[PDB]
């Protein structure tokens, strides 16, 4: 019992949310280069045998709707779950195209008591987004 | 008679440390996602996932440094941040 059971019939879903273009009301820049990320991720996780779903330019309402729908699917035959979020962010927050949503609102759908067919199975969230405005000056070694 | 925490078995692979910006190249993609895909391609049949992510940390930390004409944003670095509530090892291979 040292490693997760990964020989279920299916590896699981990989959901890639790729937000590139933002509403003018957000004051957020277009995220050039994110399509390269999204395509690299799709190929990578397909090769890992995931069922990959790419989504582009979702509002925060659409992100929440998508994540809730995914969490209410039957994952009984799936080993794991992967969600990749590519967007602007702040600490604890990712941006829909029309504004911020708390990361906790997204991940809460997959809590052990709310997504019963994923209880006991690894739930991976990969987050490319800022977490604030600090910069790391580095140190020469 | 037995429960697990509702927060158990999550892994959050963040591109950057708490409080920090995260860097993206306008043509090559983000430093973190570039590195994550490279290490999964190279190591997913060889290494446990946390060890793959540790190689991602090292790749982002050592191979990338920003360029900016604005001195405020120039020559900056990045370390990703692995946050594990997993209870078992995760292998993509059997």
């Amino acid at each position: 019992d040292n490693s997760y059971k990964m020989d279920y019939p299916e590896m699981g879903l990989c959901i890639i949310i790729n937000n590139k273009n933002f509403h003018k009301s957000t004051g957020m820049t277009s995220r050039s280069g994110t399509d390269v990320d999204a395509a690299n991720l799709r190929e990578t996780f397909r090769n890992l045998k995931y069922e990959v779903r790419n989504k582009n330019d979702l509002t925060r309402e659409e992100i929440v709707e998508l994540m809730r729908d995914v969490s209410k699917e039957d994952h009984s035959k799936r080993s794991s779950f992967v969600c990749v979020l590519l967007s602007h962010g702040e600490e604890g927050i990712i941006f829909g195209t029309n504004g911020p949503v708390d990361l906790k609102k997204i991940t809460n759908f997959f809590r052990g008591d709310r997504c019963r067919s994923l209880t006991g199975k690894p739930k991976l969230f990969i987050i490319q987004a800022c977490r604030g405005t600090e910069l790391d000056c580095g140190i020469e070694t | 008679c037995h429960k697990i925490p509702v927060e158990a078995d999550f892994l959050y692979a963040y591109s950057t440390a708490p409080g920090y910006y995260s860097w993206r190249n306008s043509k090559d993609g983000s430093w973190f996602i570039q590195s994550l895909c490279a290490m999964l391609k190279q190591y997913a049949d060889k290494l446990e996932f946390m060890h793959i992510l540790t190689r991602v940390n090292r790749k982002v930390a050592t191979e990338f440094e920003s360029f900016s004409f604005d001195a405020t944003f120039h020559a900056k670095k990045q370390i990703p941040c692995i946050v594990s509530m997993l209870t078992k090892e995760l292998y993509f291979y059997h």
Partner: peptide, 5 residues
């Protein structure tokens, strides 16, 4: 160009 997210 390098940009922040």
């Amino acid at each position: 160009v390098d940009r922040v997210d």
